[PDB]
Amino acid sequence: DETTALVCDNGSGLVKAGFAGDDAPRAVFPSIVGRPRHKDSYVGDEAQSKRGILTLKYPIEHGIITNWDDMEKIWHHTFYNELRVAPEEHPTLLTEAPLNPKANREKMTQIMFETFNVPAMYVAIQAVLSLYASGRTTGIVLDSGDGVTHNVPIYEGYALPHAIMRLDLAGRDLTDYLMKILTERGYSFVTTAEREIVRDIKEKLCYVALDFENEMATAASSSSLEKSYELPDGQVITIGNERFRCPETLFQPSFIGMESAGIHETTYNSIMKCDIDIRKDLYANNVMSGGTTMYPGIADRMQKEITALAPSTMKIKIIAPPERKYSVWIGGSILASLSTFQQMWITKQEYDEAGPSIVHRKCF
Amino acid sequence: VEHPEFLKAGKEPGLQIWRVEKFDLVPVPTNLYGDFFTGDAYVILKTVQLRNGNLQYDLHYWLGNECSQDESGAAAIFTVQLDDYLNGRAVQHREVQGFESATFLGYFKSGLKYKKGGVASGFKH
Ligand SMILES: Nc1ncnc2c1ncn2[C@@H]1O[C@H](COP(=O)(O)OP(=O)(O)OP(=O)(O)O)[C@@H](O)[C@H]1O
Ligand SMILES: [Ca+2]
Ligand SMILES: [Ca+2]
Ligand SMILES: [Ca+2]
């Protein structure tokens, strides 16, 4: 862990950080910065704990860095508080959202070199790293986290920017929804401390129905879909059709009053925006990536949903690896570890000579 | 890329086979071609002479049933990198054990063979 590459995967809700060559991130924490309402700041768990006296802020919105001052705190905390490294000693790989604006990629390069003094850095698209982690160079990635959902088709190692789809419906929106319907059932989940409990219920008991209508009817009959959940306070609650109604929103955004098409449609749509000659390869390599793709039953519903949309003779395959909450990070750890990757890094020397614009020619 | 194996790839007609070994591209002894460890991942480059004088390229990354994620991930990346180094002229093919394409199976005149085992993972767990 001395003069070892670092991999930092910055998400809207969670930062995934660690060392290249490890099979998992060493640090996972909330991408949050807390400041005194009225040290000068807290980050991550510390900020969440002292939430009561702090003003919380999320520097990344829908996968895009939006508050540069708060992002430097995140990175500082990542280096010094979580990884316990001297940044100037480690080449650092960062990840970015597909369609990440030009000036944002430059800004990220500048801060790393100018504020953190890294000896080298690199920016890679999150979805591409997920594909690499599943051992593929061609496929279409469904990346869904806490703030954004994207469909990213990739051919022979490179995203097809023209065919990428972005949807501002994800984990946080699902958590908020489960909150609303659960109190609707008779319970009461309103408080931030309660939002946290719901998120845990969302992650532990929810699932995606293979046929939503039948599921609803089957939940109105017996109580074989009902599950119990023990509150922090010891009280037990019974969760019902909400287990599958909450992630249904991914397929029917109308539930939350969103006008967009579901994730099966945006997938079919992204694929249809690609050259006809590669569609078969896309359809047979549907890789699921991120936290909001963890619902049990998600891979079977999408398998069902896209075979219905696609020509009957299309071989369809959904790949939903158990470790897909960390696929992006893992992809980065493999990439940065390769013998052939050493000349890929942007050096401090190259940065001083060319400036932040170097990122557009070195990372694409 | 200045990797020595990159400098050797696609220089002349024939078949080149490399095995992924702890995040590196390691050449396979030519006497061992066709004998694949099912616990490992490999990168195969087939170079054919075109009558136009130019060289045609087919890159195949072969994944054994028991290969670790770092090996399958690296074989895929090495493939992309070898293609780019070859000015994107290579056509990439994913080959999974038991589902290899007729083309790839055809590279091996005495038939491809599977053998249990392989080099250990490169990850730190
Ligand atoms: N088992 C699970 N079931 C459902 N949702 C889950 C599960 N595990 C984690 N999540 C959710 O996934 C989200 C975090 O996932 P992820 O780390 O991939 O997102 P991110 O990178 O922070 O966000 P984004 O990609 O939107 O910028 C949170 O909404 C969390 O509640
Ligand atoms: Ca993410
Ligand atoms: Ca192996
Ligand atoms: Ca090519």
Residue numbers in the entry:
A (entry chain A): 3 to 40, 50 to 375
B (entry chain S): 3 to 127
Quote the study's own text.
F-actin disassembly can be broadly defined as loss of polymer mass due to depolymerization (monomers’ dissociation from filament ends), which is often facilitated by severing (filaments’ fragmentation resulting in increased number of depolymerizing ends). Most recently, rapid depolymerization of actin filaments upon Mical/NADPH treatment was observed in in vitro assays. However, the molecular basis of such dynamic behavior of Mical-oxidized (Mox) actin and the mechanisms underlying its disassembly are hitherto unknown. Thus, Mical-induced oxidation of actin—including augmentation of cofilin severing—provides a robust mechanism to disassemble different actin forms (ATP/ADP-Pi- and ADP-bound) in response to cellular signaling.
To establish the structural basis for the observed behavior of Mical-oxidized actin, we determined the atomic structures of Mical-oxidized actin in non-filamentous and filamentous forms by X-ray crystallography and cryo electron microscopy (cryoEM), respectively. To this end, we obtained a 2.7 Å resolution crystal structure of Mical-oxidized actin complexed with gelsolin segment-1 (GS1)18. The electron density of the DNAse I binding loop (D-loop)—where Mical’s target M44 and M47 residues reside—is weak, which is indicative of multiple conformations of this loop. In Mox-G-actin structure we observed a slight (~ 1 Å) narrowing of the nucleotide binding cleft (between subdomains 2 and 4) compared to that in the crystal structure of unmodified G-actin-GS1. To test this directly we measured the rates of ɛ-ATP exchange in Mical-oxidized and unmodified G-actin. We found no statistically significant differences in the nucleotide exchange rates between Mical-oxidized and unoxidized actin in the absence and in the presence of profilin.
